[PDB]
Amino acid sequence: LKQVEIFTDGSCLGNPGPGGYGAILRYRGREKTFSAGYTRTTNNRMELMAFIVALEALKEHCEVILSTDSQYVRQGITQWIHNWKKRGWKTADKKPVKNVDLWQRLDAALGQHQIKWEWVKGHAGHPENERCDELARAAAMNPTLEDTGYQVE
Numbered sequence: 001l002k003q004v005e006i007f008t009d010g011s012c013l014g015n016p017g018p019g020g021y022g023a024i025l026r027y028r029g030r031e032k033t034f035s036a037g038y039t040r041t042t043n044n045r046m047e048l049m050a051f052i053v054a055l056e057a058l059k060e061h062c063e064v065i066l067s068t069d070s071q072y073v074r075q076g077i078t079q080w081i082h083n084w085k086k087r088g089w090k091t092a093d094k095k096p097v098k099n100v101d102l103w104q105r106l107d108a109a110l111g112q113h114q115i116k117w118e119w120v121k122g123h124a125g126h127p128e129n130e131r132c133d134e135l136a137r138a139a140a141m142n143p144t145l146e147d148t149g150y151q152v153e
Contacts, residue, residue: 011139012045020038035138089103089104
């Protein structure tokens with residue numbers, strides 16, 4: 001209970017296609033579950049959205065633990081975002097970084113909290129993570145939202 005715990009997953013079979021996300025936020029003495037389906041999206045965008053939604057539900061500065069098997073998110077945090085920000089959210093070719101809208105939205109949310117990242121592997125021994133996966137898959141079957149920022153190529 002001391003720290004907020006957030007668990008996430010994103011799922012999307014097409015590039016782009018219908019996708020969804022699941023997130024579990026353990027906050028106070030409670031568990032809150034978030035999940036939604038998008039008509040035309042990508043896996044990676046779904047993985048960022050899952051963090052974005054759970055973090056933005058926090059109304060004050062918290063200590064947060066983010067346990068995640070997402071490689072995309074892991075590389076973004078540990079390798080990409082430091083440089084990206086120095087470069088004005090451009091790649092070496094001076095084009096806008098892919099999914100810049102969601103990365104910036106996510107960075108602004110992380111910027112509110114004491115974040116502890118735990119990078120983890122398969123589903124075994126991560127029941128929350130496995131439930132988020134189930135949520136994300138279910139939402140993708142029944143997409144009802146528009147992924148407004150998605151761009152081709």
